[PDB]
Amino acid sequence: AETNEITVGITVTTTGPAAALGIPERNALEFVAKEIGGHPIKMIVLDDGGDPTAATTNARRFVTESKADVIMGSSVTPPTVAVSNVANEAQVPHIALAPLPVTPERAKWSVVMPQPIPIMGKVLYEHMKKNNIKTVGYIGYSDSYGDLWFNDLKKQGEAMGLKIVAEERFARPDTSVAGQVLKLVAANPDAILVGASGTAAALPQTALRERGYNGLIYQTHGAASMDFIRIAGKSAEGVLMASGPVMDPEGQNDSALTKKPGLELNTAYETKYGPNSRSQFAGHSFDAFKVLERVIPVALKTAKPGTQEFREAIRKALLTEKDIAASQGVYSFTETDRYGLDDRSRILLTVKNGKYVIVK
Numbered sequence: 001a002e003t004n005e006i007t008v009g010i011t012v013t014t015t016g017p018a019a020a021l022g023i024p025e026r027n028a029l030e031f032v033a034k035e036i037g038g039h040p041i042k043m044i045v046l047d048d049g050g051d052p053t054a055a056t057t058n059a060r061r062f063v064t065e066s067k068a069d070v071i072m073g074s075s076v077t078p079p080t081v082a083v084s085n086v087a088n089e090a091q092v093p094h095i096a097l098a099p100l101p102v103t104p105e106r107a108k109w110s111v112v113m114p115q116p117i118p119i120m121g122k123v124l125y126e127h128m129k130k131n132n133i134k135t136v137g138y139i140g141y142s143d144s145y146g147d148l149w150f151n152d153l154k155k156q157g158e159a160m161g162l163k164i165v166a167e168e169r170f171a172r173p174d175t176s177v178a179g180q181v182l183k184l185v186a187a188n189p190d191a192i193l194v195g196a197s198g199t200a201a202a203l204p205q206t207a208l209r210e211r212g213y214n215g216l217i218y219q220t221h222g223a224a225s226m227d228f229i230r231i232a233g234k235s236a237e238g239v240l241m242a243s244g245p246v247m248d249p250e251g252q253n254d255s256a257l258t259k260k261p262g263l264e265l266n267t268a269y270e271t272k273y274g275p276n277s278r279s280q281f282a283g284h285s286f287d288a289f290k291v292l293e294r295v296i297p298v299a300l301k302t303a304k305p306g307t308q309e310f311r312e313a314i315r316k317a318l319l320t321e322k323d324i325a326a327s328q329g330v331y332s333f334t335e336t337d338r339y340g341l342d343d344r345s346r347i348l349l350t351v352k353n354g355k356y357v358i359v360k
């Protein structure tokens with residue numbers, strides 16, 4: 001059934017432990033295109049609170065009630081897996097805003113805005129090698145996101161000559177990691193890698209410093225916003241953190257494809273929300289619309305919004321529209337690469353005097 005508007009269902013996490021990721025994603029929607037190819041965009045923006053059940057419910061609603069042309073979300077990995085499962089069963093294009101283990105069952109209908117974990121691990125393990133780190137301890141979520149990172153540390157990390165000497169896990173809502181941190185200190189690794197996101201990533205950060213761990217601490221791209229620094233305080237000093245280029249458009253070459261989109265997003269965002277309010281997360285939902293600005297006019301050549309033919313045409317256009325310039329990288333998807341990113345999609349940050357600083 002044909003419609004004038006293009007319908008985009010968005011489920012993000014604006015309450016609960018991961019609200020630090022979902023709020024900037026929702027807030028960045030004020031600055032995306034409101035019309036593509038003559039057609040107005042109608043967004044239905046829902047909270048899932050990070051819960052995979054809620055995300056399933058929202059994604060099913062997008063299919064059976066909203067009849068969405070495209071689904072986007074969620075903000076953290078477990079509900080993103082749930083969304084991807086629903087979108088693939090229902091045959092609806094899905095743009096993930098959190099990392100997703102992309103299996104054959106999820107690969108046809110899902111693409112992924114966040115940088116794949118091995119691209120981010122590479123830059124962290126290289127820094128470790130360059131700084132005489134041999135032994136490494138890990139603390140991460142007891143879920144698929146914590147697994148993705150531990151698995152990369154084990155495969156890519158060990159291959160580069162690192163030795164993992166401790167593995168601890170914690171749950172997203174935990175308010176204490178006392179026992180886990182005590183085992184990490186006893187192990188005394190050269191460095192610790194934290195596999196977490198948002199404000200929760202600051203919990204092992206502060207706890208390690210409080211218990212007298214003085215070694216280097218590495219954080220993932222899940223931690224890349226002001227919230228981490230606000231909660232970690234002094235304990236964030238000297239942290240090494242993987243991040244997308246949206247954290248430093250000013251530092252990029254004038255000719256870099258990521259520069260104009262990053263300046264555009266950050267200029268508008270930080271004017272509303274103050275200096276250094278840029279985030280990894282606002283980059284993803286802004287970039288999801290950069291992708292739609294490219295694929296929708298192509299799909300409009302074969303079909304109209306609100307039809308299964310339009311959804312299928314979007315899916316094909318994601319395969320043929322190459323080098324999509326965005327704040328976080330330059331995207332080119334294939335049948336088997338649903339992330340579509342390269343080295344232009346990552347930089348390395350540290351923290352000095354409560355500010356993010358590029359490590360060159």
Ligand SMILES: O=C(O)/C=C/c1ccc(O)cc1
Pocket residue numbers: 021075076077078097098099114115145196197221222223280281
């Ligand atoms: O907590 C998680 O499952 C991961 C969150 C995440 C979100 C955006 C990123 O770019 C990286 C990690």
